[PDB]
Amino acid sequence: YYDIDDVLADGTEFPCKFQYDIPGLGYNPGRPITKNTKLSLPLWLARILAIVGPVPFVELLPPDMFSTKVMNAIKTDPVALDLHSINSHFFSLAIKWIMLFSEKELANVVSELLLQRAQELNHHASSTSTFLLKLEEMEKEIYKKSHESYKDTKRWMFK
C-alpha cells in the first residue's frame, strides 16, 4: 500500500527456510538452492510463498523477535520495555505475522501490551523524557497526533 510505514514494514528480514529446491537463484552461484536452506527473506515476497504451493514453498520459522522469551518479557513490564531496539517495527509487523501464521495465542498478549503502552501514552500526552525514544515508529506517530491535539487545544484555551 502507499503509506510509508507499511511498505517499510515489508522490508524486514525473516528466517524462512525453503521447503523445496529452486534453481535460478536470484540472490549467488548456486545455481540451485539446496533444500531446507535457511535464508533470510523480507516479508513482502515471503508473505505469499507460505500460501502458494498442497505443501507451501517455505516453512515460516518463527522470527527471533517473536521468541517466546520476548513474548514472555512483554508480559512483565511493557511500559519499561524498549520496542524501538528490537525491530523497530512491531505493531505494523506483528499484525501481519499474526494473520500469516494464524496464531491466536499471542493476540490476547499484544492486545494487552498496546493498552499498557497507551495508558502510558495518554500520560505523555500532557504538556518527554527518555521514554519517547523507546516507542515503535508507528506508535510514535500516534504520539505526534495526540500531543498535537492537546497542544493546539491548550493554545486555543488562552488567547
Binding site: D10, I22, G26, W44, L45, V52
Partner: peptide, 15 residues
C-alpha cells in the same frame, strides 16, 4: 520449478 521465477521475481516488479 520454473513457476517460481514468474512468481517470485514478478513480486519484485510489484515491490
Amino acid at each position: 520449478v520454473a513457476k517460481c521465477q514468474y512468481f517470485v521475481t514478478l513480486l519484485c516488479m510489484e515491490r
